[PDB]
């Protein structure tokens, strides 16, 4: 008998469709979805499934991220629901469970494939900037007045990273830091890029418009020669997915080519 | 002659679905409605409906929310229809119009039986909790930096002293306050509820990332023991509907499961 | 040959329809774009075209907007694309551009009966206007905590200005100015004005609550008096286009009907 798996995000679903497994469950989404899961039952927001109907469904297997662990861990295992939070915070991390995946449910070639191609994508960026000067970056994650500034550790900060940009912030142990505006000035980032995840581009462009006159950022030189950038929330979501490899090269276009 | 009815939101309209009345008027949505209006002419915006496609309709009653009679109360008046603004503060109140709905439009015996099956599943959620110790809890509605606390007089804070919740709101005349946190934090809330009505789950998780960071939350006792719940916006909204039973079924989770 | 056109934004798009003009690309919506144009290519969002597909699309002239100029005329150039930012920061910048593109595109018979209807509807308001006694008003972008103030020289501010509003700021030469409260409730709005561009009602009424209870805001004598409206953002857009007519209509009831 095949196992029964749930996936919760349009991201994990889209890897089990390159593993070629079989779902009972995915989540509920505005996104589309690849087509083989066209009649699968729908579990809910990924943001917080629902837990009735996936009992229902009498899984081997829920799949969920690292980063909603710590709200969704209890209400699994209060339902009696096996589930796996997989670590979507870098590129590398997102490759890891890949192969773990492929080892878990007898698709190990399909993994492997995977991940060669990932990896041939991200060598290809790697290579292309590795001799060219590298611009310092700040990446802001949110709203006016509650931006949170994104490290090396999440997975935008790992795009970054491996896009050849170096974070004003370094040696940091968090995911997120609350905003030190004052030192991000003296700091003087080259560029600058928000990512305002699931807000519609006609709201992030008001808060462009905002940004531009607060005494808060505004004497930043990047804001002065403009080069701050909106990352498309589209693309660029809070943590990794196969959507990568086109999220790197975009990255990579940003950093460079101004 | 059946009376002519336009129903300006979603929630009225599930309403006169199991009233059994036919609407000449539906709200523009992209909410699923009842299949019999499948064909019924939209209105506009909930909350600021189209007062000359309604007009046109020459309605005998056109119906609204208490919460929103300040802001359309003069557009109505001025274009010479009749309206009333139901109180979907409390399922109490909404209970009421729903009986003087049945009254209003012969439909005495559908309202009385939607109001026993509300009143059985209210029952069950009241007869559960009556035993059990109560948590303290602070309801907050709104965006980073923005917060209302939510008292006993708005919806969801009747859902939380339905299933037994304590606000550590008490005493106040109006359903939302401005938020004076470091009363809040000596008041020690054991659980935070957070609702941002109408806005995407992915915007809320970003949210949700802010608030751990954000000195003016994070040391509270809530924040430190994963106490700090984000209710599902599809189901959770600013006023009362006939999702109320699942929503206090899923507030007794919240408060109780961990 | 025809020329080979991609319209970036909704609004271009109508104007193109209009002038009875083919495209060989459109935006990326969710908005009902006109029907000729139902099988053309997508080419991504109007705030950030996707530069790969209209390469490929080989266009003679790319069309955008002013506002977006800075955000997009470097990608634009380095993809060897030739494109045009019309100026829809006015109802009068946005007809000389209709002109401009009559003449551009061999549609001057079309431009110019689209601009006949333009100016009197707008001239119709005009004239019912003109002798009334005028109020006084404040425009706002944004969300709590970021409002800006919208002056004459946006198109938000060019609707007041046209049904016959007078801004409370004068003499300025920017579109957005950051919001100094403490001067603007001295100057005492007889109407408030705000615009979520892009933002689901549901969160509008939310913000409502907030204004409604902050120390900022609350003791405005438009707060006082109930004087404060939420453009329909599905309406009011940031930048002008074709529902100018409607936006204005829809202005003058605001501004005197009370
Ligand atoms: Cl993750
Ligand atoms: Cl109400
Ligand atoms: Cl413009």
């Known amino acids: 008998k095949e196992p029964k798996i749930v996936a919760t995000t349009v991201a994990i ?20 979805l690849p087509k083989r899961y066209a009649d699968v039952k729908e579990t809910g927001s990924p943001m917080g499934p629902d837990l009735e109907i996936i009992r229902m469904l009498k899984p081997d297997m829920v799949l969920s ?55 041939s994508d991200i060598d290809q960026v790697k290579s292309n900037v590795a001799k060219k000067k590298k611009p310092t970056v700040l990446i802001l994650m949110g709203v006016p007045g509650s931006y949170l500034v994104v490290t090396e550790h999440a997975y935008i900060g790992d795009l970054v990273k491996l896009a050849g940009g170096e974070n004003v912030i370094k040696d940091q142990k968090v995911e997120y830091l609350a905003s030190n505006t004052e030192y991000l000035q003296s700091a ?71």
Not at 18 to 28: A, E, F, N
Not at 81 to 109: P, V
């Open 13 to 32: 679903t889209e890897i089990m469709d390159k593993l070629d497994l079989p779902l009972v469950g995915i989540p509920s989404s505005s996104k589309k």
């Open 188 to 258: 003087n980032p080259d560029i600058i890029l928000r990512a305002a995840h699931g807000m519609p581009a006609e709201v992030v462009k008001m808060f462009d418009e905002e940004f531009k006159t607060n005494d808060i950022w505004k004497h930043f030189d990047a804001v002065k020669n403009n080069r701050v950038y909106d990352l498309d929330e589209n693309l660029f979501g809070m943590t990794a997915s196969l959507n990568a490899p086109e999220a790197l090269k975009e990255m990579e276009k940003m950093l460079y080519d101004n």
């Open 65 to 119: 991220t690292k980063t909603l662990e710590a709200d969704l861990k209890s209400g699994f295992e209060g339902a009696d629901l096996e589930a796996d939070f997989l670590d979507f915070t870098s590129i590398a991390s997102m490759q890891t469970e890949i192969k773990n995946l492929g080892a878990k449910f007898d698709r190990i070639e399909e993994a492997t494939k995977l991940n060669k191609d990932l990896t």
